[PDB]
Symmetry: C3
Subunit: 333 residues, 3 copies
Amino acid sequence: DISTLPRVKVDLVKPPFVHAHDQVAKTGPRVVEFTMTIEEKKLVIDREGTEIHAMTFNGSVPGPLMVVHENDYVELRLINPDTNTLLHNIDFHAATGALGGGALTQVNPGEETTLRFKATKPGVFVYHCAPEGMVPWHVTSGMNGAIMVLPRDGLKDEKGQPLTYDKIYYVGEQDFYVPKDEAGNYKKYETPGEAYEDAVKAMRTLTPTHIVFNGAVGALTGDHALTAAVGERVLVVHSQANRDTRPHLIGGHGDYVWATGKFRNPPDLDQETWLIPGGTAGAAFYTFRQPGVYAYVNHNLIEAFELGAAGHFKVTGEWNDDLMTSVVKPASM
Amino acid sequence: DISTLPRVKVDLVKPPFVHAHDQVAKTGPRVVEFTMTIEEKKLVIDREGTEIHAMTFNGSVPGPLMVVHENDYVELRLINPDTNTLLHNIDFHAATGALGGGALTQVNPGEETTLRFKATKPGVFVYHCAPEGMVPWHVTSGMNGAIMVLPRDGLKDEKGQPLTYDKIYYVGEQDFYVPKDEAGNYKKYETPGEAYEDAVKAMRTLTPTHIVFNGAVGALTGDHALTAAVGERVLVVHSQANRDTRPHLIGGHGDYVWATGKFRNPPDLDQETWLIPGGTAGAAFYTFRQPGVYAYVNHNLIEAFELGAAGHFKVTGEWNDDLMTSVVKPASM
Amino acid sequence: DISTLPRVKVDLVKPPFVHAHDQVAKTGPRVVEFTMTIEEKKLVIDREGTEIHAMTFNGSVPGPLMVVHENDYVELRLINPDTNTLLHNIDFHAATGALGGGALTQVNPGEETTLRFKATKPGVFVYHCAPEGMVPWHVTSGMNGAIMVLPRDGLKDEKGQPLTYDKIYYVGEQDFYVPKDEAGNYKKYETPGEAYEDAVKAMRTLTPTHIVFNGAVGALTGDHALTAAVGERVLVVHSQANRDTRPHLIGGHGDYVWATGKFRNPPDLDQETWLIPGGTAGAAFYTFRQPGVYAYVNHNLIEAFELGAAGHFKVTGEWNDDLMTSVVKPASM
Ligand SMILES: [Cu+2]
Ligand SMILES: [Cu+2]
Ligand SMILES: [Cu+2]
Ligand SMILES: [Cu+2]
Ligand SMILES: [Cu+2]
Ligand SMILES: [Cu+2]
């Protein structure tokens, strides 16, 4: 059966961008092939130079967004180069069995494996490393991403009418627990393992030191702000593999929101803020109506502005005074 | 096109009360004018005289609930008198563009401004101050409220049938982060500015020292309990501009609940407890069936009974023994 | 009216198991009688021998799951033996009035009472102890459980079609706040009262020391794993009377989920992870498709693997290669 299906090799693109794909499946079920290389590396996560030992899928935090269609077969070739120090694996929340595939993909440095699973359920799911015994350590070190299993007929609204996005962005939110000394100074380590004991202790506090989008504070701001234009329909895939988050686009709304990211369910309309539970990936659909800067944040303002969970959207177009206008600009009474 | 619309000036009421308004709109779209004066002031939040420098809209925490209908234009005159010391502005989650209006309403002490926006989406929304650089500080200082945008044809239940409320109450939940000294005693400051450095440190722990309704522990209890009678349909608007909450009516339920506050979505039925994400406003509809005292709480019992998130409802009427009764045991058949 | 109704006595079972019941009602309304004895006792919650004074309903944490049909009358005889030292009561989120029954059920050691209430709304609900003044303390000491009110015609899917489970398990999640000394060593006390002052100080941190399923770390692991077979439809009722949780079945999903547990609402399909707000009980329906070990966890992985919120499912049956297969077993590059 499988021996007969057409295969397609996909070339991944780094977040917040997504690889080429069709919203509406143009062919029948296929075997979509992906290859990802694990990479342990030092990452500066804020302006003050705080450094950590990140464990990543394909060199990024989060790992790249993988897109397939319902009933396609995902075949992932996972490589763990001998330059790494730890054993890793991969568990897909979209798969059924073997701990999401984690029990069949344990690879030590210098090893690789190829797993195949059927994407039987449509929606955006989280995937993360989950080694027996150090699950939370690998996930909170950035070893997680997301996979989108689109319905063969694309997205539909609350009434079943097709929804087509012009742009799609992937925002992976990551909660970090960086160890500190007595004074409050962040620790630095030579290798990941050296950091383990202090890491566990920091994690148990349940209070992150950093909460960031795309691997670093301000990673999606300035020259890296997400772009769009008035009239464009944008889909924002947001994931959090360990902690709850409440996404909010300041100045806009979530026209169609699948807070828990599962497409067979009708979307919630006109959301100002929605809650995505830890270990879940959700999606929001919006059409820009006003130009200018928008802030995409975690609506716990402390977590957004103090801890780093804030990004930007730079939108181009003409201002609509009907929707909003300054009747009297600020001036002395 | 707008000059042909009727303009009406509304006087805001202090929470938990709401100004008069029609659930089913009797007129076509209008320009509803509101005026709010910013007031920075000391506020006693608990029985132990703990005092803070509250930053308020119209002198209260939360600010008053504004009610308009879908497609009406909201025209707000925001005044910042010279007696204040900080720059403030206003961001509406109901508005489209310019950071919710925040970018267009920055007013220094002694300034004022008038903003207008079209309420294009029905539901209850959060509005809060959001100054560049000190967003979480103004919000956790009580500078937030809500605005309800009623569908022109009123509320509808899961099956499109009319839902009419006899009473409406606005409950604004506020998380405070008061700084303490080495022992745990709450600090007092002369001006808001003086508190700033300590406030930031307190916020970063992500652990509130108080969580209150209507700005103080027990603000909604005793002589201030919310009232109703058996048979009355009551709508309870609940907002939390920065932190998750999970409302619950002890001894009752939320017959029709819009946990994320957007009316185009069908309500959730028979809710015991619902989650309202931080940065969101929600609404619950319930018909009282039993007289007595009811406790309205944030169902993280520690937050309700230790930190302050608990209020009362005093309902009058006749007891229904078929619903509940203390059993008398003189029988075997 | 009640006098002429059929009465059926039911002997409760210890969690994760549930007493015998019918999904679809074969009779009209009934008076279902239950008896619960309150037991204050020492409990060891972790592998390190940590001990606490648990306050239980029927000797377990959580209390047994009670199951009735919509419109049945629940008659509960609550006994507080003279061996206990504290006053207790019970509050059902399923009942209407008198604070869910708490106002009618206060019993000191040596007293008992019988409460009757109509189960007017279908769904799974939380019930817990709530003595005026020490609510959080009693709930966090393990005094909570859940009651399931089935629609008279059983469960239905999104399209109104019948849903029949073959097995039902009850998982009560508990957040514990064990007091610690200067070094971080857990305290031990002679009686519940001795622990009060410290317990309050530990609760106010809002940070659990333990978060466990069925009363202790590993209560649902090893020889205690929940069991099923490929092809069986399982319903997992999950409750959390005080804090938010986000269940997830690693290697599986929630085919039909009632996150907030109220059956008049349609279930959410294909959930990977769902949020159950504190003070709520939810239910997930799943049909096992692959054999092997599955981990049922709270998807805040730190909470699951460090604090204790993790359990197992051992499923029997034949492996399905179409759903998942290891194309190339881990091997040296
Ligand atoms: Cu790993
Ligand atoms: Cu997972
Ligand atoms: Cu302000
Ligand atoms: Cu906001
Ligand atoms: Cu008790
Ligand atoms: Cu309760």
